[PDB]
C-alpha cells in the first residue's frame, strides 16, 4: 500500500476509511482517487469516529487475516455500520468520471495499529490505526 507524501499512515487511514465526505460513494471516492491518482476498485468507509478506532487499537492483539505474519491487528468487538464502495465505471485518464456503487452493511472490522509518526502525528494519540485489514 502507498499514500501521498503529505499524510502519515494514520492520516491516510482517516482519509480513506473515516472521513466519508459525502454519503454517496461516487462523490466520496473522488477525494481518495484524486489523492492516489487512480480509481480504487473497492473501498470501505466505517461509519464510526477516529477516536473509536483508536480505542479498538486497545483491544487484544490478533493475527492480521490479510498479512498473517503480522500481529498488530485488533478486532472491533462489535459490529459497526459501514459502506462499501465498488467501482462500476473506470476512467483512468479522467479520474473524476469514475463511478461507484454502494453497499451499506453492519459488520465487524479488523484494524492494524502502530505507534504514531513521531514528527507528524499529534501526541494526542500514541497508538493509531494504519490499515483496514478485513471486514467481516
Amino acid at each position: 500500500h502507498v499514500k501521498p507524501p503529505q499524510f502519515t499512515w494514520a492520516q491516510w487511514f482517516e482519509t480513506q476509511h473515516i472521513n466519508m465526505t459525502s454519503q454517496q460513494c461516487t462523490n466520496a471516492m473522488q477525494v481518495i482517487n484524486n489523492y492516489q491518482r487512480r480509481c480504487k476498485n473497492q473501498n470501505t468507509f466505517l461509519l464510526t469516529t477516529f477516536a473509536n478506532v483508536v480505542n479498538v487499537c486497545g483491544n487484544p492483539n490478533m493475527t492480521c487475516p490479510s498479512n498473517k505474519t503480522r500481529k498488530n491487528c485488533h478486532h472491533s468487538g462489535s459490529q459497526v455500520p459501514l459502506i462499501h464502495c465498488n467501482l462500476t465505471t473506470p476512467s483512468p485518464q479522467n479520474i473524476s468520471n469514475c463511478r461507484y456503487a454502494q453497499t451499506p452493511a453492519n459488520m465487524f472490522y479488523i484494524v492494524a495499529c502502530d505507534n504514531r509518526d513521531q514528527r507528524r502525528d499529534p501526541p494526542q494519540y500514541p497508538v493509531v490505526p494504519v490499515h483496514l485489514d478485513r471486514i467481516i
Side-chain angles (χ1 to χ4, degrees):
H1 318 85
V2 301
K3 60 177 173 62
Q6 67 269 34
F7 288 87
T8 65
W9 291 106
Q11 293 167 339
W12 184 237
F13 177 94
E14 187 182 29
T15 297
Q16 293 201 295
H17 301 301
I18 302 291
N19 288 344
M20 197 181 175
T21 57
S22 173
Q23 291 191 47
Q24 295 294 313
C25 282
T26 293
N27 294 339
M29 290 301 302
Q30 291 170 346
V31 171
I32 293 170
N33 291 345
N34 281 338
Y35 279 128
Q36 288 297 57
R37 304 310 304 163
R38 56 180 206 94
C39 298
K40 270 193 102 167
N41 199 48
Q42 177 296 148
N43 185 70
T44 299
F45 292 99
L46 303 176
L47 303 184
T48 202
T49 70
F50 187 82
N52 288 353
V53 184
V54 170
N55 277 322
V56 166
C57 295
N59 287 346
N61 288 58
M62 82 175 355
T63 300
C64 297
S66 80
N67 217 305
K68 45 126 297 143
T69 65
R70 285 321 299 277
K71 189 53 174 280
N72 64 331
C73 280
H74 307 272
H75 197 268
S76 63
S78 60
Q79 298 186 327
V80 298
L82 54 77
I83 301 165
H84 299 295
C85 303
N86 289 96
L87 183 62
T88 62
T89 297
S91 176
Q93 312 84 189
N94 195 194
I95 288 168
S96 74
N97 284 348
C98 287
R99 304 177 88 79
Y100 289 78
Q102 178 159 358
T103 298
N106 292 286
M107 289 186 288
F108 299 105
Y109 65 88
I110 295 167
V111 63
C113 308
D114 278 335
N115 296 328
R116 74 172 178 90
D117 189 76
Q118 178 261 130
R119 167 166 115 60
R120 290 186 294 161
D121 275 324
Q124 179 171 17
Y125 292 125
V127 175
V128 285
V130 296
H131 297 294
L132 184 60
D133 198 87
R134 178 82 357 98
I135 308 298
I136 329 115

